[PDB]
Amino acid sequence: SHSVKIYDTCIGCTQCVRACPTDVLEMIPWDGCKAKQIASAPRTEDCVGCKRCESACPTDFLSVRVYLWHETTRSMGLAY
């Protein structure tokens, strides 16, 4: 559904996923920062698009980035 992307300007603060209410994100090891971790987005099918991840990305503009795309029943957040 939605296309979440994490760019290399990350600082590995783990606020994107700790804010993400649908388990879309997960921190993985990395070698590009002092924290040695970066966020990944495997479960984009569960992505609703609420952008709580990028409302908590403390960078110049953003590192995590949500692109609104094909909306399915779970990206639209429907219990019916």
Partner 1 sequence: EVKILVDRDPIKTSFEEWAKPGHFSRTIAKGPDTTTWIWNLHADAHDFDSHTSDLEEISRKVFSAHFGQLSIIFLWLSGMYFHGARFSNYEAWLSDPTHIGPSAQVVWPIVGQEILNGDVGGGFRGIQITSGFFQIWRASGITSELQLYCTAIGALVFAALMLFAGWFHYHKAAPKLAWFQDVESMLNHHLAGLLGLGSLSWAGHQVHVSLPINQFLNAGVDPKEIPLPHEFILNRDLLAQLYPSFAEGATPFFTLNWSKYSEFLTFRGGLDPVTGGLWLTDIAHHHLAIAILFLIAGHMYRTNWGIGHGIKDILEAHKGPFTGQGHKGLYEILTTSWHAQLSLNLAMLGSLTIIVAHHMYSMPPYPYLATDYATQLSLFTHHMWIGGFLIVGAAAHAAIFMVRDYDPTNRYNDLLDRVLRHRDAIISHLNWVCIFLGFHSFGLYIHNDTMSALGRPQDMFSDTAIQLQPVFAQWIQNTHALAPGVTAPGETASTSLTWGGGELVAVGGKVALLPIPLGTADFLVHHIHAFTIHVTVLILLKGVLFARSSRLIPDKANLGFRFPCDGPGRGGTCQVSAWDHVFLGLFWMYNAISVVIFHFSWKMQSDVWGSISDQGVVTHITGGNFAQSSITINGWLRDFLWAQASQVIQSYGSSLSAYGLFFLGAHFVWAFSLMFLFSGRGYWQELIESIVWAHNKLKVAPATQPRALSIIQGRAVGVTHYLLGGIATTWAFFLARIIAVG
Partner 2 sequence: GFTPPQLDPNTPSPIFAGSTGGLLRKAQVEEFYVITWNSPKEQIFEMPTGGAAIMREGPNLLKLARKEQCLALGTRLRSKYKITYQFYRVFPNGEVQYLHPKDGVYPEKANPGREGVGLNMRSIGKNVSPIEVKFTGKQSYDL
CB of 54 to partner 1, least distance (A): 9
Q: Which of 32, 31, 28, 44 is nearest to 20 (CA)?
A: 44
Question: Which of partner 1, partner 2, none does residue 70 bind (CB under 5 to 8 Å by kind)?
Answer: none
State how far the Cα of 7 lies from the Cα of 66, in Å rounded to an integer. Answer: 11
Cα separation of the two ends of the chain = 18
Binding of partner 1 by 18 (CB under 8 A): no
Question: Which of partner 2, partner 1, none does residue 72 bind (CB under 5 to 8 Å by kind)?
Answer: none
Interacting residues with partner 1 (CB under 8 A)? 2, 21, 47-52, 55, 66, 68, 71, 75-80
